[PDB]
């Protein structure tokens, strides 16, 4: 009579959530060489990137230098909103005023750049100043996009400057929230609540949703209207990028994987003869200066951004070759297999003493 997990309501525990480590991509019939695969994808309904990667809007990840490097690499960067409005507009102008076949450019031939804003009248003034500076895409960047205020802000921005710039809606984790964002007029939906490597929301508040299931649910609401999905947070390997794209996301937003590059803001730190640099959540105590939802830490230095992007894109191309996907649209139709805890350790290198770190696999 009772539900097998307790109680009498079968909907109290709605579903079993899967994350990146729970699934593997199944190989399929292939006619695709990894070098010949096309990795272009839609960032928004009007913007297409050669490489479907976007830099996170964090004060230890993206400033003008990172945005320029990401745009030249074939992606795009999103400037963080921790600095004043005038400084953010200056960074936008620095990017717009700025070897690279894949570089993403607008109609005037200048590099594309995105900028993050919050909610409120101060956020409205920031958004208007950024728009007048020549921004290409505004990110309503919150922790909970299903709030009434976030939806109202997206609606207002679409009404005011929808012709000039694209508007992306903040993080959701359910089908209903994505549907609400689509109804509000968002040109793209960002997915993920709590999976970030520096996030403590799922511990502090106990609220979250595993990223693969969240992407599936959000795509189920966004695809019929042609609204692209950006998987944000929790990606540690190029295989995770491939899994995120196969689940239905159109682009991926990278955090820790880029915080260690030379183009990220911040100096270099030496610890026991090894190089690191600072990486902190935007809900951390230091960043928000309270109940923090992030931590402070450091990540190992990786070097130039181009090399990291090349490794990630090579992994994605290998995945596309394995699944037989000529385009990202075809990759979005691939199938998964669910694995157990033993399958995960089988997947990684095992019963071996690794003698040297590979370029795409770190200890």
149: contact with ligand NAD by CB under 6 A: yes
Pairing of strands 48-49, 53-55: unpaired
Binding-site member from 52, 75, 169, 194 for ligand NAD (CB under 6 A): 194
Binding-site member from 104, 201, 311, 332 for ligand NAD (CB under 6 A): 201
Please report, for residues 48, 257, 312, the alpha-carbon distance to residue 72 in angstroms, rounded to integers and kept in the order given: 14, 18, 16
Closest to K ion by CB, 54 vs 198, is 198
Phi, psi of 92 (to 5 degrees): -60, -45
Check the annotation: does 161 bind a ligand.
no
Check the annotation: does 233 bind a ligand.
yes
* Nearest-approach distance from CB 196 to ligand NAD, in angstroms: 6
Q: CA-CA distance, 199 to 143, in Å (whole number)?
A: 11
| Site stretch for a copy of itself (CB under 8 A), options 40-48, 54-62, 183-191, 321-329 | 321-329
Cβ(123)–Cβ(85) under 8 Å? no
Check the annotation: does 286 bind a ligand.
no
Check the annotation: does 343 bind a ligand.
no
Phi, psi of 328 (to 5 degrees): -65, -35
Q: CA-CA distance, 336 to 29, in Å (whole number)?
A: 15
The partner residues of 53 in beta bridges, in order of sequence, read 252
* Nearest-approach distance from CB 234 to ligand NAD, in angstroms: 10
Cβ(196)–Cβ(181) under 8 Å? no
Binding-site member from 105, 220, 225, 307 for a copy of itself (CB under 8 A): 220
Residue where the block lists tokens 């990291």: 308
Q: CA-CA distance, 165 to 186, in Å (whole number)?
A: 11
For the segment 298-337, give every residue that binds ligand NAD (CB under 6 A): 318, 321-322
| Site stretch for a copy of itself (CB under 8 A), options 21-29, 71-79, 81-89, 119-127 | 21-29
Binding-site member from 287, 321, 325, 328 for a copy of itself (CB under 8 A): 321
Q: CA-CA distance, 36 to 25, in Å (whole number)?
A: 20
Q: CA-CA distance, 205 to 293, in Å (whole number)?
A: 8
* Nearest-approach distance from CB 59 to a copy of itself, in angstroms: 15
For the segment 201-220, give every residue that binds ligand IMP (CB under 6 A): 201
Binding-site member from 276, 301, 326, 329 for a copy of itself (CB under 8 A): 276
Per-residue binder mask for K ion (CB under 5 A), 196-215, x = binder = ---x----------------
* Residue among 130, 199, 230, 247 flagged as catalytic: 199
Residue 137 interacts, among a copy of itself, K ion, ligand IMP, none and using kind-specific CB cut-offs from 5 to 8 Å, with: none
128, burial (CB in 10 Å: exposed 0-12, middle 13-18, buried 19+): middle
Cβ(34)–Cβ(321) under 8 Å? yes
Q: DSSP per residue over 49-92, as a string?
A: ESS-EEE---TTT-SHHHHHHHHHTTSEEEE-SSS-HHHHHHHH
Per-residue binder mask for a copy of itself (CB under 8 A), 185-204, x = binder = --------xxx-xxxxxxxx
Check the annotation: does 306 bind a ligand.
no
Measured from each CB, the residue nearest to ligand NAD is: 321
Please report, for residues 199, 252, 354, the alpha-carbon distance to residue 234 in angstroms, rounded to integers and kept in the order given: 10, 10, 25
**What CA dihedral angle connects 274, 299, 42 and 327, to 10 degrees?**
50
Binding-site member from 4, 101, 109, 226 for a copy of itself (CB under 8 A): 4
222 is catalytic: no
167: contact with K ion by CB under 5 A: no
Residue 254 interacts, among ligand NAD, ligand IMP, K ion, none and using kind-specific CB cut-offs from 5 to 8 Å, with: ligand IMP
Catalytic residue set: 199
Query: What residues are designated binding site for GTP?
Result: 97
* Residues of the binding site: 56, 97, 141-143, 192-194, 196-197, 199, 232-234, 255-256, 279-283, 293, 346-348
């Amino acid at each position: 009579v009772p539900v097998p997990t307790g109680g009498d309501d079968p909907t109290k525990v709605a579903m079993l959530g899967l994350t990146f480590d729970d699934v593997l991509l199944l190989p399929a019939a292939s006619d695709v060489v990894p070098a010949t695969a096309d990795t272009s994808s839609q960032l928004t309904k009007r913007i297409r990137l050669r490489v479907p990667l976007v830099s996170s809007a964090m004060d230890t990840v993206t400033e003008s230098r990172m945005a320029i490097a990401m745009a030249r690499a074939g992606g795009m960067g999103v400037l963080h909103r921790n600095l004043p409005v005038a400084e953010q507009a200056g960074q936008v102008e620095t990017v717009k005023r700025s070897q690279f076949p894949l570089s993403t450019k607008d109609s005037d031939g200048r590099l594309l750049v995105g900028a993050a804003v919050g909610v409120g009248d101060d956020a409205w003034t920031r958004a208007m100043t950024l728009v007048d500076a020549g921004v290409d895409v505004l990110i309503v960047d919150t922790a909970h996009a299903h709030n009434r205020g976030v939806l109202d802000m997206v609606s207002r921005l679409k009404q005011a400057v929808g012709e000039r710039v694209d508007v992306v809606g903040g993080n959701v984790a359910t089908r209903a929230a994505a549907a609400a964002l689509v109804e509000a007029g968002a040109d793209a939906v960002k997915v993920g609540v709590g999976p970030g490597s520096i996030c403590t929301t799922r511990v502090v508040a106990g609220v979250g949703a595993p990223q693969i299931t969240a992407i599936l649910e959000a795509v189920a609401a966004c695809k019929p209207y042609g609204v692209p999905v950006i998987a944000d947070g929790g990606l540690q390997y190029s295989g995770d990028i491939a899994k995120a794209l196969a689940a239905g996301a159109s682009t991926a937003m990278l955090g820790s994987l880029l915080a260690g590059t030379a183009e990220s803001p911040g100096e270099l730190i030496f610890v026991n003869g090894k190089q690191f640099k600072s990486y902190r959540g935007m809900g951390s105590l230091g960043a928000m200066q309270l109940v923090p939802e992030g931590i402070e830490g450091r990540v190992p230095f990786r070097g130039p951004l181009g090399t990291v992007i090349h490794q990630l894109t090579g992994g994605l191309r290998a995945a596309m070759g394995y699944t037989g996907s000529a385009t990202i649209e075809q990759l979005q139709q691939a199938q998964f297999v669910q694995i157990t805890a033993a399958g995960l350790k089988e997947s990684h290198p095992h019963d071996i003493t690794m003698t040297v770190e590979a370029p795409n696999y770190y200890t």
